[PDB]
Amino acid sequence: DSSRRQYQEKYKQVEQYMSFHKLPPDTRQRIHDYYEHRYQGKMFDEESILGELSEPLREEIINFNCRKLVASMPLFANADPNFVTSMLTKLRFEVFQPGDYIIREGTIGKKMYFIQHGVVSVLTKGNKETKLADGSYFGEICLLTRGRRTASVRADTYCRLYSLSVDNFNEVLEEYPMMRRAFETVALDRLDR
Amino acid sequence: DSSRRQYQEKYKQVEQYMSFHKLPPDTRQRIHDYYEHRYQGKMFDEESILGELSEPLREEIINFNCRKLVASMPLFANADPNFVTSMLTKLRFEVFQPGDYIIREGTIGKKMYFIQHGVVSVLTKGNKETKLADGSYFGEICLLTRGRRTASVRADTYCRLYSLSVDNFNEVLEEYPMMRRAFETVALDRLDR
Amino acid sequence: DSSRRQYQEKYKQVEQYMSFHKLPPDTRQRIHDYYEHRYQGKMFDEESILGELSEPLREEIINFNCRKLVASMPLFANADPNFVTSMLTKLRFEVFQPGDYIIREGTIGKKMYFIQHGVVSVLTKGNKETKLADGSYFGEICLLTRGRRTASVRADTYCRLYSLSVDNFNEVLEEYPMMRRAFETVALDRLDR
Amino acid sequence: DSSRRQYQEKYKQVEQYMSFHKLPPDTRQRIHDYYEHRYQGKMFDEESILGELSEPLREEIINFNCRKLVASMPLFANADPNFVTSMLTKLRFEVFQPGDYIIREGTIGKKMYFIQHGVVSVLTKGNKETKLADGSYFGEICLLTRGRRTASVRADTYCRLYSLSVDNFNEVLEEYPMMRRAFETVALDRLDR
Numbered sequence: 213d214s215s216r217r218q219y220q221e222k223y224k225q226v227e228q229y230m231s232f233h234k235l236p237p238d239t240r241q242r243i244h245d246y247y248e249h250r251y252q253g254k255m256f257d258e259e260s261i262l263g264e265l266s267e268p269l270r271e272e273i274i275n276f277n278c279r280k281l282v283a284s285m286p287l288f289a290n291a292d293p294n295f296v297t298s299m300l301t302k303l304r305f306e307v308f309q310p311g312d313y314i315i316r317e318g319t320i321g322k323k324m325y326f327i328q329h330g331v332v333s334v335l336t337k338g339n340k341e342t343k344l345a346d347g348s349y350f351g352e353i354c355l356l357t358r359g360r361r362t363a364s365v366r367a368d369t370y371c372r373l374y375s376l377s378v379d380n381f382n383e384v385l386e387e388y389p390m391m392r393r394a395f396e397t398v399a400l401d402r403l404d405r
Numbered sequence: 406d407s408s409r410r411q412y413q414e415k416y417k418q419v420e421q422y423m424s425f426h427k428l429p430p431d432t433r434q435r436i437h438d439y440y441e442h443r444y445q446g447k448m449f450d451e452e453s454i455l456g457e458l459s460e461p462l463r464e465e466i467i468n469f470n471c472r473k474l475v476a477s478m479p480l481f482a483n484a485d486p487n488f489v490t491s492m493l494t495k496l497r498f499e500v501f502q503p504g505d506y507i508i509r510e511g512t513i514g515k516k517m518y519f520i521q522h523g524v525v526s527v528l529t530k531g532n533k534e535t536k537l538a539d540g541s542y543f544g545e546i547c548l549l550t551r552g553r554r555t556a557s558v559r560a561d562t563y564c565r566l567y568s569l570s571v572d573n574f575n576e577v578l579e580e581y582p583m584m585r586r587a588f589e590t591v592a593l594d595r596l597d598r
Numbered sequence: 599d600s601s602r603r604q605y606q607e608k609y610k611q612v613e614q615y616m617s618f619h620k621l622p623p624d625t626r627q628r629i630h631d632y633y634e635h636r637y638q639g640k641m642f643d644e645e646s647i648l649g650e651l652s653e654p655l656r657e658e659i660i661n662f663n664c665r666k667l668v669a670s671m672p673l674f675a676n677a678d679p680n681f682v683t684s685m686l687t688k689l690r691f692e693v694f695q696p697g698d699y700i701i702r703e704g705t706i707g708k709k710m711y712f713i714q715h716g717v718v719s720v721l722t723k724g725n726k727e728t729k730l731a732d733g734s735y736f737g738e739i740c741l742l743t744r745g746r747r748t749a750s751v752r753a754d755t756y757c758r759l760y761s762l763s764v765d766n767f768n769e770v771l772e773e774y775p776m777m778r779r780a781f782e783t784v785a786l787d788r789l790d791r
Numbered sequence: 792d793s794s795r796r797q798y799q800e801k802y803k804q805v806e807q808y809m810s811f812h813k814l815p816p817d818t819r820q821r822i823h824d825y826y827e828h829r830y831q832g833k834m835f836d837e838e839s840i841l842g843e844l845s846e847p848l849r850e851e852i853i854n855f856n857c858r859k860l861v862a863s864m865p866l867f868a869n870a871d872p873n874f875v876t877s878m879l880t881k882l883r884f885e886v887f888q889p890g891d892y893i894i895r896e897g898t899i900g901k902k903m904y905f906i907q908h909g910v911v912s913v914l915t916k917g918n919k920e921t922k923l924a925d926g927s928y929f930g931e932i933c934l935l936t937r938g939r940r941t942a943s944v945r946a947d948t949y950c951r952l953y954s955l956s957v958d959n960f961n962e963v964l965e966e967y968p969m970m971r972r973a974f975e976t977v978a979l980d981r982l983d984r
């Protein structure tokens with residue numbers, strides 16, 4: 213753990229930031245708890261390690277680290293393993309906090325999200341909200357037809373998510389375009405209900 | 406206060422540069438004062454801190470940091486908080502010196518500006534000068550017309566500004582179509598006199 | 599050698615990485631081995647240095663550095679000195695392990711490959727496997743017709759390769775268009791066989 | 792100045808690179824010498840200093856820094872001074888050596904060059920050499936006709952050049968369409984002689 217050092221070195225930097233801007237005690241509570249959930253004691257340049265290795269090693273390594281997330285992922289557990297690997301290599305780990313608006317209706321959407329751990333409300337205007345939890349995913353609609361978000365999605369609890377940007381989503385469905393209808397169908401169901 | 410030391414250390418290399426170049430006394434006094442006024446003893450990797458946090462937190466922090474600018478701005482007076490946040494996250498801090506031309510008539514423009522603090526004169530070939538100060542904005546005409554600057558704008562005092570690029574303007578206005586009218590109105594009234 | 603130390607220090611970071619993710623013994627051995635072949639005890643910023651020099655110097659160097667690769671290389675010998683220089687400057691060094699799939703049939707190809715040192719099996723579906731080594735190249739067919747990979751290519755031994763992106767490939771034949779044919783020629787004997 | 796430090800540190804790193812790849816004594820001499828001419832014992836990060844100041848300061852600094860260059864150029868003689876500034880802020884300093892081909896005929900050009908100090912020979916397949924020096928420029932033809940290099944341009948002496956990319960070139964001219972014609976004039980003159 214020299215990555216224990218970094219966490220502290222970098223959190224010291226954030227306390228001087230909060231100081232300098234005199235953020236209210238609540239806000240500092242949030243920043244601090246987030247930072248704890250997100251880095252969980254440690255900071256490292258994961259991407260620059262993987263950057264140093266071959267593509268196959270990256271793929272092996274990523275598959276190991278994510279075999280749990282995958283088995284617990286309806287859409288991956290079931291799919292061609294190569295599609296899975298390619299999706300996995302493009303996933304960015306993200307944390308959100310109770311009450312956070314992950315997607316705001318009307319926005320232009322740049323990411324879509326996968327639920328590793330957490331619960332989330334999907335709020336459309338005029339109707340009862342619905343929920344999504346571990347295993348599900350949202351935000352694919354705007355990725356399919358560039359466009360304004362169709363619903364707001366608010367974290368109901370701490371959420372550990374993996375995002376996928378619009379470019380990477382496109383890159384992947386270019387690689388595995390047989391997999392686009394699978395997202396289209398889901399978009400479609402969601403849009404009529 | 407490593408921020409304090411970073412500021413003495415960075416101004417040292419600026420002291421280096423000025424020397425290796427024989428910068429006239431006048432110039433080097435403008436640079437030093439600029440430096441003092443813009444960094445004010447403190448030099449830190451703020452964007453690097455902000456980048457370690459979630460979007461929701463960047464929003465909460467920015468909204469707090471800027472609550473006084475927002476308060477001083479007729480444009481945000483009665484508006485959707487999300488529109489406001491959206492605007493804030495795309496503004497960039499700038500500082501100009503007495504005498505500086507922030508905008509020249511007849512030029513291609515891709516930036517507008519929101520005055521946080523200071524006083525600016527608006528010059529038009531053939532007319533009386535007017536002035537603008539805390540809370541106002543300028544350079545929206547060009548962003549609307551996509552043509553050229555219809556007037557020059559010169560700082561009368563040290564100005565603390567927040568610029569906003571045309572791409573950013575249009576994106577925000579895409580998400581918040583109703584706010585396009587606010588800018589047209591102010592532009593037109595400005596042009597009707 | 600100061601950049602012996604680099605290798606030695608960065609690898610310790612690779613060590614913390616494998617520990618943190620509890621990677622299988624076989625995976626760790628594989629990484630240890632890859633990192634050993636790829637860097638040979640020595641890590642330093644190449645890009646950063648060639649970056650500091652003029653283009654003509656960069657070219658004087660790459661030509662010298664790679665004369666033995668060029669010698670080994672049939673397509674180069676009878677080609678323009680300038681074509682050879684322009685290709686070298688776009689080549690990226692990449693290492694594969696025994697067993698690694700370099701190219702997988704059916705994938706979208708964005709790269710082709712020249713073999714400094716390696717042996718590689720070429721496996722077309724339901725018919726006789728073939729090999730390629732030092733001097734040879736593969737992955738050309740795809741960059742030629744912007745379609746899918748017509749064979750898989752697996753690495754028999756450690757493979758020291760120089761890759762070349764589609765954009766880059768395109769760039770160069772658009773400059774020396776005489777030279778496209780050479781690839782087309784080697785592509786077509788391969789397709790009909 | 793730790794920029795005398797940087798220089799040594801960065802130059803020590805070139806040496807290790809040179810030893811490592813075992814470059815013939817002549818190649819080493821040219822590297823060594825380029826480096827001395829290009830950096831002249833000092834290494835700092837210009838771009839990041841100017842990067843910490845306002846646009847009007849950059850413009851004042853540059854206009855000073857380049858008054859001889861400007862003085863030296865017929866082009867800039869009776870030019871709208873805001874156009875000179877616009878050109879100036881987009882020039883990148885470059886060094887070349889006796890014998891360097893700055894431009895090879897037939898290549899696809901993406902830059903043009905303004906001679907600060909140096910003599911260059913201009914070679915046309917068939918015709919006789921001519922020479923350009925302090926205060927002249929070359930490379931514009933390709934920029935005006937997004938096409939091939941109509942001539943080679945080799946350096947007779949050490950040259951201190953300022954290059955302008957086609958993007959910046961097309962931007963300055965978008966801003967100043969009048970000026971595209973000063974360039975066409977010379978281009979045509981040079982083509983028809």
Ligand SMILES: Nc1nc2c(ncn2[C@@H]2O[C@@H]3COP(=O)(O)O[C@H]3[C@H]2O)c(=O)[nH]1
Pocket residue numbers: 250251252253254255256257258305
């Ligand atoms: N703790 C931590 N995780 C990171 C960092 N950068 C990327 N990650 C990844 O985010 C993942 C979150 O879940 P894990 O604890 O499995 O492993 C983590 C890493 O693979 C970092 O700086 N700290």
Ligand SMILES: Nc1nc2c(ncn2[C@@H]2O[C@@H]3COP(=O)(O)O[C@H]3[C@H]2O)c(=O)[nH]1
Pocket residue numbers: 315321334336342349350351352353354355360361362363364365402403405
């Ligand atoms: N419109 C809509 N979106 C839903 C529903 N249930 C889940 N979602 C997700 O909420 C997301 C909000 O942003 P997108 O429009 O990008 O994609 C939407 C869907 O992925 C639903 O019933 N209607």
Ligand SMILES: Nc1nc2c(ncn2[C@@H]2O[C@@H]3COP(=O)(O)O[C@H]3[C@H]2O)c(=O)[nH]1
Pocket residue numbers: 443444445447448449450451452470498
């Ligand atoms: N003083 C200072 N401010 C910075 C720096 N980098 C970014 N900033 C931001 O610029 C802002 C200027 O206005 P504030 O004083 O409100 O807060 C400042 C910071 O939010 C820096 O290096 N020094």
Ligand SMILES: Nc1nc2c(ncn2[C@@H]2O[C@@H]3COP(=O)(O)O[C@H]3[C@H]2O)c(=O)[nH]1
Pocket residue numbers: 508514527529535542543544545546547548553554555556557558595596598
């Ligand atoms: N033309 C004009 N512009 C004004 C006036 N008062 C303020 N401005 C601002 O000055 C700006 C000059 O740049 P723009 O034409 O982009 O946008 C203009 C307006 O935002 C005015 O009375 N006339």
Ligand SMILES: Nc1nc2c(ncn2[C@@H]2O[C@@H]3COP(=O)(O)O[C@H]3[C@H]2O)c(=O)[nH]1
Pocket residue numbers: 636637638640641642643644645691
């Ligand atoms: N050791 C090392 N070599 C590199 C790197 N990037 C590019 N290279 C080059 O790739 C070359 C492969 O063969 P060599 O080991 O002879 O020399 C190597 C370097 O010139 C790097 O990060 N480390």
Ligand SMILES: Nc1nc2c(ncn2[C@@H]2O[C@@H]3COP(=O)(O)O[C@H]3[C@H]2O)c(=O)[nH]1
Pocket residue numbers: 701707720722728735736737738739740741746747748749750751788789791
């Ligand atoms: N189709 C085919 N490709 C071959 C053969 N031998 C080598 N290759 C190479 O294998 C590569 C696989 O990827 P590509 O189809 O792009 O390009 C192919 C060729 O360069 C062969 O017998 N048939």
Ligand SMILES: Nc1nc2c(ncn2[C@@H]2O[C@@H]3COP(=O)(O)O[C@H]3[C@H]2O)c(=O)[nH]1
Pocket residue numbers: 829830831832833834835836837884
């Ligand atoms: N010494 C040095 N000069 C640089 C560097 N980057 C840009 N330059 C500029 O290159 C210019 C060459 O001519 P001058 O010596 O007048 O001024 C020099 C600097 O402004 C660098 O890294 N080191």
Ligand SMILES: Nc1nc2c(ncn2[C@@H]2O[C@@H]3COP(=O)(O)O[C@H]3[C@H]2O)c(=O)[nH]1
Pocket residue numbers: 894900913915921928929930931932933934939940941942943944981982984
């Ligand atoms: N064709 C031509 N080019 C010249 C002559 N004198 C100078 N040049 C420069 O040489 C340059 C080579 O690159 P370009 O063709 O882009 O632009 C050309 C001119 O700017 C000349 O007499 N004929």
